[PDB]
Amino acid sequence: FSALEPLVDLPIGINITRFQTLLALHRSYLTPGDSSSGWTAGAAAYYVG
């Protein structure tokens, strides 16, 4: 069991009906380092409810 605590409150007035997540891509000299095959997604899992 885990209890979640408030962090921040925003006063923005926008309306939201959709959203998306942003991921980090690793580029290095061990890979081609391009947008075709040099990217690596690493290890990560996120669950949506």
Partner: protein, 50 residues
């Protein structure tokens, strides 16, 4: 200009001197009440306010 967003500019609030151990009318952050203030041992969580 006022919009659907909540108002965020107004006259600054004034903090009067605290009075202890006497039945006094009080207004803490918009919470109004009539009672006697005393020092309390119980500890709140940081985000909790009352």
């Amino acid at each position: 200009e006022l919009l659907h967003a909540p108002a965020t500019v107004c006259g600054p609030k004034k903090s009067t001197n605290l009075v202890k151990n006497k039945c006094v009318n009080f207004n803490f952050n918009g919470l109004t009440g009539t009672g006697v203030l005393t020092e309390s041992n119980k500890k709140f969580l940081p985000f909790q306010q009352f």
